[PDB]
């Protein structure tokens, strides 16, 4: 976009509950334009981690992804010939979306028997701060912090 700012889109709520961020999470899951299978993966994973976390269902998910949810993100501007990275404050709308993207990638990289089982256990350990998802956030965080001077 050279200039024009666009209104974003109202995404249809998940069928079981009323959370829009969860339906968004579904969208970041699905490959192959298949909403129903990946959405089944969302559910199956969520409820199979639910009782084990001890929180009931969704609030376990927010308290989960909140830990992988970045605060400051680093981009590249004003290259000096060496192309240095500048840290900038990430939008509130991009922080949870970026989170969800990171967790989904985290699930895919290591592998396990099934994605629902895989997603759930990695997220459960993301709520603990074991996961490679949260680790991904911290390395991003270190890189931002090591280069704070530039602003």
């Amino acid at each position: 976009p050279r200039r024009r700012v666009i209104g974003q889109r109202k995404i249809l709520p998940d069928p079981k509950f009323g959370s829009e961020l969860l339906a968004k999470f579904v969208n970041i899951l699905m490959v192959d334009g298949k909403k129903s299978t990946a959405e089944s993966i969302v559910y199956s994973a969520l409820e199979t981690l639910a009782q084990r976390s001890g929180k009931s269902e969704l609030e376990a998910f927010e308290v989960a992804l909140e830990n992988v949810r970045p605060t400051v993100e680093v981009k590249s501007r004003r290259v000096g010939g060496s192309t240095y990275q500048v840290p900038v404050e990430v939008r509130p709308v991009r922080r949870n979306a970026l989170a969800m993207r990171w967790i989904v990638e985290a699930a895919r990289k290591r592998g396990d028997k099934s994605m629902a089982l895989r997603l759930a256990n990695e997220l459960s350990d993301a709520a603990e701060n074991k996961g490679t998802a949260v680790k991904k956030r911290e390395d991003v965080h270190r890189m931002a912090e090591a280069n704070k001077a530039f602003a």
Partner: protein, 127 residues
């Protein structure tokens, strides 16, 4: 003693009859839950009526053709929302505030020449 609306979305056209009396809903002589009701977008079809009172007050005998699952689902949706003809002006504001009255035209784009899917082209190489 009967009220009507149409609705349609993406190649699938809906026809919807609402009446007073019981609250049961049926699509093509078959129950909603066993027509498409076991697949996701469970909510979309009953949500316009959930925006106001649902109770046992209104029966829906509806039938549709064409399109797939979700195309039909939305078709029905737009069906009810323009089938609430009784009290339509009084429920009109609620509907538009929450949408549903817009048809959402938005149908498939034609495959063009030289490009395979309507917008995608055959990976241009530079030499």
């Amino acid at each position: 003693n009967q009220y009507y609306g149409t609705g349609r979305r993406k190649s699938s056209a809906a026809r919807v009859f609402i009446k007073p009396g019981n609250g049961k809903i049926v699509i093509n002589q078959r129950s909603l839950e066993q027509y498409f009701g076991r697949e996701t977008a469970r909510m979309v079809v009953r949500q316009p009526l959930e925006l106001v009172d649902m109770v046992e007050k209104l029966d829906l005998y509806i039938t549709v053709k064409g399109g797939g699952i979700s195309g039909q689902a939305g078709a029905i949706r737009h069906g009810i929302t323009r089938a609430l003809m009784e009290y339509d002006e009084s429920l009109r504001s609620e509907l538009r505030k929450a949408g549903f009255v817009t048809r959402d035209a938005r149908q498939v784009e034609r495959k063009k020449v030289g490009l395979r899917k309507a917008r995608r082209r055959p990976q241009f190489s530079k030499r």
